[PDB]
Subunit: 236 residues, 4 copies
Amino acid sequence: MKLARFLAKGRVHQGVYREGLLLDEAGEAHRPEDVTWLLPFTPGKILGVALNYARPEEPALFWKPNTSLLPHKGVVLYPKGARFVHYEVELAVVVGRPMKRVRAKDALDYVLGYTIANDLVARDYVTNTFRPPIRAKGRDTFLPLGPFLVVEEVEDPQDLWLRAYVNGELRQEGHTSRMLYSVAELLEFISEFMTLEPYDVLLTGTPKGISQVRPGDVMRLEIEGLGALENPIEEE
Amino acid sequence: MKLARFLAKGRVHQGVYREGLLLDEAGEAHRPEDVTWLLPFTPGKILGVALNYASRPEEPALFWKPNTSLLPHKGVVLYPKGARFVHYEVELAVVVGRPMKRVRAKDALDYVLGYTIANDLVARDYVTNTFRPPIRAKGRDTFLPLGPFLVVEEVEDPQDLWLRAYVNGELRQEGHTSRMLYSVAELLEFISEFMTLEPYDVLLTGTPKGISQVRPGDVMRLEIEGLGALENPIEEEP
Amino acid sequence: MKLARFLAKGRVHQGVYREGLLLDEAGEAHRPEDVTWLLPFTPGKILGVALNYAGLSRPEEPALFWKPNTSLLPHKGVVLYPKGARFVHYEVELAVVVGRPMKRVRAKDALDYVLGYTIANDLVARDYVRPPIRAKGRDTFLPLGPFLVVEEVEDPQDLWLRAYVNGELRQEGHTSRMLYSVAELLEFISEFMTLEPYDVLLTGTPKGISQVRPGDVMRLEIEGLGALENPIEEEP
Amino acid sequence: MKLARFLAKGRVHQGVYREGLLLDEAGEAHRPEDVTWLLPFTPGKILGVALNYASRPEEPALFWKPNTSLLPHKGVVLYPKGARFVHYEVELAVVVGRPMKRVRAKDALDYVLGYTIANDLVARDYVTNTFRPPIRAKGRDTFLPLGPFLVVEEVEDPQDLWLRAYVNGELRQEGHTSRMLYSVAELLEFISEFMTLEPYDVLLTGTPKGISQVRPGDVMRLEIEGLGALENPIEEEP
Ligand code: NA
């Protein structure tokens, strides 16, 4: 099922998405257009692997602060004066059980589900890969996530198409099978030295392509079987 | 006030440390040796700064420390199996008290709740030149002893505090926060300019280089002017 | 200052209310009409006191009761009227927010532990009136807000209380008439129960013409704390 | 499996109880005697039902227990100074696993995550007919020992479990959940009809009358079929 959270008439609902509608805890159906989308869950810590699409001897891990989190339909703030702001459609993996020293072959047995992430980045602030890209990628609103927490629906995370649209125009396409380090490998590498807890999130990277956005653009990211994450952009 | 959190007889207490004793919410006294020390508060996000002690980096070299690295006073630090170069790092930790976004340096300290001590440990074997210092080197479990107190309304100037580190009771290093390249105010201004800092988020201000290597069996005791002493023994991973 | 929390363009803001304007963390202005009001803070446990307004003596001890966090509703949120209920009433009450841990605190020291104040509408369905949980702890039965007012209230026992239904004044009261003061209540409660920062104490309400019906718009006001407004709809 | 949480060497571990041993997230074993037991999970809101054991009341007599009453296995219960009639209450505790609103009884148990043992203590000295039982009598600090485990996927029928309570090693009472006036399913239906229950919220199902008076110094050990044993000593307040 596709779990979601939304705000309606002052109440936060934890529901399920079916046949284009949101069913709340009481079984009452809601139309997406009538509610205010929220994050499908509350993320613990969020790590991402850079340059993971065609390999490096070790995953180049980076952090995304929770203050960068943004829900579906939320507005991404374009850095004042920036010139090179890109979007990054990526498969987000949500941990379901505590992970510590878990073998790659068992890694998937600990996953709760998946969702869509827009790992934005402002290249203007990146000199090179020497220091962590915190000012360039950990900015407020730079991590739209959702709209759903898809549980027990994805058969293989390494076999999913990835698409991205800007103002409706398909400006990108790709597949996750071309992932240098798999989800199971990333979880194994990470959990060897760091305990991953339920709801922690792993961003798996994105393939290179047309991704520069400007104020006024509406980005729509889609991943096989995970719905579509849409976010407009505006100057700060 | 030196706020502290501890576990005693099954109860978690949010109290205060005074003259050697721990007082709980009701004012009842507890001996440190009879309780289990906990983190003085629950940290939100934690950022550190590399090379911030004595021209300086064009901009603060920020990095992240995961919450799973957190360890309370007296907790056991786990030495990475097979590692050969593990170092402690005595740093002044700054705890945010009010939401910060685009705060000027001259106003930054007005948003600070209090201060505590941090041991920003690093396993240099894992250090690289990609997003340095890498998460695998700085964010291992237990690599962030923090505490024992959340000292509020006591620190006059964060840029005027001595730093000391002991290993097995012997002084290994002496520093002073006046030697900070980027001041606490400048760091908060820099970070809050693009990232909202929420109450209880923590900023690790760096440490001066020294004879900081440690090995299994060693007991690290870090002290900062007016912030007490953070002590942690090191054991080898099971 | 009047602290407030609101949702705007997908972002949750912790700001302040000045001159009819909502200022976010960065100090940027927001028009109330452009945002979605939320609770001014996240409450811990909420206790209320019954019969606290009246040669009859006051109760031998405060008649304490609980309001579940699931009853909480923000300013402008929709209160749900119980199907078939004949006697649903609003209750305008001064809500006290704890700021420091309280255990065995003396009345003379009690107010020193208070963070701030806000308005509460402690709704009740008298039809279902043992702890009145089914009558008082229903979902949406605790509108709370709009602000967490700190460092402004000089004396909690010297504030007027007012309630309007559909813009028409229904009742006027004054906190000086409380049988047990805020200080006495916190002393009584903290004697046996540890109160934590953000726990809330509802101080009661004087009897009045407070019956409400589906379609009604309730606007409660307390001296210096603004106005809390909530419309009522029949349960879906 | 019997889920448990414990503190060891400064670290909070979420483990599993197998063959009298606690295994952490990494699979490493810990001896109980070497760790500090904690609550098996963090409860949301807790509701209890009064007079639920041997027709029946028109509707369940629901009441609240504050999270501040929560106490872990082995924790010390504080006896109210001057109280003359304090009683333990062995009850089956039901832990909600999925959001519940307007759930029918026939489907209720499908929303249950697991079960645990609860000691719903009461100081009868403070009971009257005003919102009975009063919060002052039931909601005192430490008046809700809970645990030691969150037993999931093991209880086949909550209405078919024996209840036992021992004071200082001596059997004080024996009961059975089949004697519940309102079943777990009926209670969750009644409650969820007007109140949304969230994951980790807890329902206390009541207890049968018995010789349950306890005094300072007593060691209470409550047991429920398949849920282990919850033990707590009693001490007088400071
Ligand atoms: Na009331």
